[PDB]
DNA sequence: AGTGAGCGAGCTTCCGCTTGACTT
């Protein structure tokens, strides 16, 4: 009888472990990590902070020795474990079977400093057998796995706190760069460039409702569509030559409003024959059970939930004991879960809808770690979703309903059906051998679909015969080729998973991180990159390309495996990565000279002007169009010929609205934004000359000016009256101010001219150098020469 | 005696594990 102390990661797991292991057992939780590198200069411990150069938390010159400090929030949890350790016999470290949990075991060892024998308890599924077997057969700490966790923690540290300060001095302050986020942002930027270089092509489709009811009128209504016409096929959106114009034009034929509109009008009905009929039975295999990435994607598709929202719900379900661990990267179900899954389906849906052999899904993810089982309902027997409606919330129920269906459907039979593919041929009345086509699908055996819901896109039909006579409602609609869709929260995560980037505990947080730093804007349900993202990604692609390559994360994992099995030393690769060496793999940083040289030796050699200047296209005249970033808001800029200095080009600029997306900045919109007024409000165009009149605010007062096309004439100005306002003045009021110096006539006494204007002190007329005041703004236009002479003498 | 020019401090940031609870 030995009293053993057990330390797990999740507190709700600690309750279940303490239930399986009884009296002589004390199970407590650590709530994740207890130590980590100091995040800022404040977290650095007083002694080791003030003296050396520990901004990185890894004094690299001293053999990459990390600086671990205990979290102040967990500082009360660490002291709680030290007190319980002095009253037990042995210490079991029961962290997850991942390389992060192994480090947590080591960190608990180096912090508590146990003067007591220690053993390593590991387990995948959390059940009574799995934990009793694990507690009876412990293990030893894997130092090679712990050092592989420190290698990546320092790697993400050197990547982070050494490259992001380059962005500060070359893009904008407080920005960030990383191994995980910079690739996701590069993905969003690269996808946006695909839309910014995508040219659309317009085509016309012709829908038709086939009237085959004169054959067999045994409900029936069938719709069809045209496929080809003689040696020319109906061009669709599939001829974009990968987001361009078109390719292979001899096989297809483009359709416009008049060309396709003639085929629908050339034959309302026609004597057509069935050239081919072919039906075939199809199948559809079920989906693997839920891991974290697949749950976040299907919650967004079927429930319109967000990653941050989905995980908050699943946390409630897990902590209350309704599902298993939601942060998982494995689709494996435990033997108890499979027995619960097949019994639940056999009892409810029946024995016919189950599967003979238990279905195992072994499609592993790139550099997965397999520490937990798939997200599935808790308990040795699954509680039906209807048996939990009284306790669950609205969001809790819908999510548990989606999780329960996924687990059960993963063990049910395949779906068997049959599709219908019929082709219609013949000739046209105008003189063309047109050929139509219509495809349909019909389900037969549901199987797993009885608990799930386009594997069942249906288009019912009646009957037909090969070579039977059919008769042809007609409509010709036009379409344009659509650009490749942007990334959502789901489509981005599945993109990172295909690259081995991110972990179940970071998916929902990557979205929040790239948003809270201006790199991406969430336009409803799509991730739109900003111009800062184009500048940050544009910089990293040209000076740290190996760091932002999609294979870089896979190249790191292959290097951490040689440290996990014990073939390569921990410090060796970090030394080569940070300082260099001819032992590079392909085009690695070691073959480049090390990250330190790639940062300190490039600060002098980065052109922030070209980095913040993002050329989008060339205008109709061939001049390049840039997008300056950081210069007090993003705006357009281009170098045009200068009127005063010949040769030396002058830049014209146009402020860009913050709500404009990068793919919407077309050359047609660019020149229209250049013609917009600089800082004033535009009033209109004067028909007498053709100049645009605007109302600005200058050094003296609110005035009105014309613009000139780039004798040598000056721009005519005119200061508005006291009765006018800067935003209320019209083009009419302006056009009067532009000719305000009005010569009411010459005075015969002194030969001088009399002109009426308006100044600071209201309206006034001047008799050469003598000027008298007026009492009405409108009277400078109604003043006669006679009335002006009566007061001037 | 109140304001607050003009010069210009010291700071920013990386991945992953995982629940925390006070008083005014």
Author numbering: 13 to 230, 233 to 467, 478 to 496, 498 to 735, 756 to 838
Published text:
These bacterial topoisomerase I protein sequences exhibit a high degree of sequence conservation in the N-terminal domains D1–D4, where the active site for the cutting and rejoining of a single DNA strand is located. We hypothesize that while the N-terminal domains of bacterial topoisomerase I containing the DNA cleavage active site interact with the G-strand ssDNA to create a break necessary for DNA strand passage, the C-terminal domains also need to interact with the T-strand ssDNA with high affinity.
We succeeded in obtaining a new crystal structure of a catalytically active 839-residue form of M. smegmatis topoisomerase I (MsmTOP1-839t) in complex with a 25-base ssDNA, MTS2-25. Within the structure, the 5′-end regions of the two MTS2-25 oligonucleotides in opposite polarity form a 12-base-pair dsDNA containing six non-Watson–Crick base pairings and mismatches. In the MsmTOP1-839t monomer A structure, the C-terminal D6 and D7 bind a ssDNA segment in a 3′ to 5′ direction. Each domain interacts with two consecutive nucleotides, primarily through two parallel π-π stackings. We do not observe here any interactions of the arginine residue on the β-turn (R724 of D6 and R805 of D7) to form salt bridges to phosphate groups of ssDNA or contribute a hydrogen bond.
